[PDB]
Design a protein around this ligand. Structure first.
Ligand SMILES: *[C@@H]1O[C@H](CO)[C@@H](O)[C@H](O)[C@H]1NC(C)=O
Ligand SMILES: *[C@@H]1O[C@H](CO)[C@@H](O)[C@H](O)[C@H]1NC(C)=O
Lengths: 189, 178, 13
């Protein structure tokens, strides 16, 4: 099937700063990926983003009742829906499971990679650090970065490249808003 | 600090529509257009809130009308296919005989039409699979998740097979134990 | 308790 496709998108966005103290509403219309017209609550009228959207801005801006609907959106739409969903979105906290296992940069060489697998947490902001015998190791650290699982949980792997010596204790330390104290997991050579 | 987006689309000639709410990149719910039901991404969401699915149907009807208008205005300029990036990963560190989930992440593509197949040892599997709807990105492409619960063994290999009009051949992304 | 939709409006023809 090589028939041409045509896509229309609309995104009505509510941006919240300090709870619902500062709220910005954006009404955005797109043809394929091209935003052609938008309403920005900072402005209070539709403005064409590209030439394609000039007719829509002029026509919609002539509808005072429509504009007054959009000017009230920060209250009647954004703040309202925030109050509806806040208890299970804004306030969602799911602490991570932390697992440490060894691996190899080269399948034939010996174990020279410590993986700190941090799984199932929400929200996304997290800090993961490596320690060798109580001292933070910042060199040789590589990560997948933040991974969305698509089910309101995140994961991340933080890997430390190192040659373990007998005696050493490695610590992976996780901080996250769901925790009141750092979560640490040790690994011994 | 937080962003809630009500994202809609309508696609011709497929006559596909979609209506969803996003919170900080996660789906709160979408509306099943054929059943006219609100589908909460986590079931527990539905006990703390509701949504009248009819409102989505009304918006999608306007989006359809606007697509026809904008198609004309553009002189029937079609969308350019953007093929996806595909990643396969597991929900949690893998241990033999301990239940887990394979995640197939399909990212950065348009249009929102895709064929996805899970393969176990080269054979299609459908038992217990699930998927998300098309999820919006900030660059206005799409992403999507497909899920396969599985029991890790050393005998089974897996692939996520993704077809998309922007790809010349199907994209296969492999997973196996280790 | 009810999430409220923002309506979309029709472009000029
Ligand atoms: C469509 O073609 C008309 C007539 O040449 C032109 O005025 C208009 O700018 C075009 N619109 C596009 C290419 O978006
Ligand atoms: C999916 O497969 C069907 C046939 O089952 C085909 O008609 C359609 O073009 C395919 N879609 C994509 C995006 O490859």
């Amino acid at each position: 099937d090589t028939r041409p496709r045509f896509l229309e998108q609309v995104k009505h966005e509510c941006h919240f700063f300090n709870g619902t103290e500062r709220v910005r509403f954006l009404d955005r219309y797109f043809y394929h990926q091209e935003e052609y017209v938008r309403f920005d609550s900072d402005v209070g009228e539709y403005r064409a983003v590209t030439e394609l959207g000039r007719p829509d801005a002029e026509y919609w801006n002539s509808q005072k009742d429509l504009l007054e609907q959009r000017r009230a959106a920060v209250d009647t739409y954004c703040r309202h829906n925030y109050g509806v969903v806040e208890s299970f979105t804004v306030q969602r906290r799911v602490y991570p499971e932390v697992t440490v296992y060894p691996a190899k940069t080269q399948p034939l060489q010996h174990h020279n990679l410590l993986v700190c697998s941090v799984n199932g947490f929400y929200p996304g902001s997290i800090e993961v650090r490596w320690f060798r015998n109580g001292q933070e190791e910042k060199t040789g650290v590589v990560s997948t970065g933040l991974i969305q699982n698509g089910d309101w949980t995140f994961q991340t792997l933080v890997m430390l490249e190192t040659v373990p010596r007998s005696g050493e204790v490695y610590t992976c330390q996780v901080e996250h808003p769901s925790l009141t104290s750092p979560l640490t997991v040790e690994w011994r050579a | 600090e937080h962003v809630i987006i009500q994202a809609e689309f309508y696609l011709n000639p497929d006559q596909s529509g979609e209506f969803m709410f996003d919170f900080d990149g996660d789906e709160i719910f979408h509306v099943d257009m054929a059943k006219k039901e609100t589908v909460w991404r986590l079931e527990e969401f539905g006990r703390f809130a509701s949504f009248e699915a009819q409102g989505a149907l009304a918006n999608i009807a306007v989006d359809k009308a606007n697509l026809e208008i904008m198609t004309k205005r553009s002189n029937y300029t079609p969308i350019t296919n953007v093929p996806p990036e595909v990643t396969v990963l597991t929900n949690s560190p893998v241990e033999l005989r301990e239940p887990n989930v394979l995640i197939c992440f399909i990212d950065k593509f348009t249009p929102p039409v895709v064929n996805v197949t899970w393969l176990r040892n080269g054979k299609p599997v459908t038992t217990g699979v699930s998927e998300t709807v098309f999820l919006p990105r900030e660059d206005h492409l799409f992403r999507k998740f497909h899920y396969l619960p599985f029991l890790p063994s050393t005998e089974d290999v897996y692939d996520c097979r993704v077809e998309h009009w922007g790809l010349d051949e199907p994209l296969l992304k492999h997973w196996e134990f280790d | 308790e009810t999430v409220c939709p923002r309506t979309t409006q029709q472009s000029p023809e």
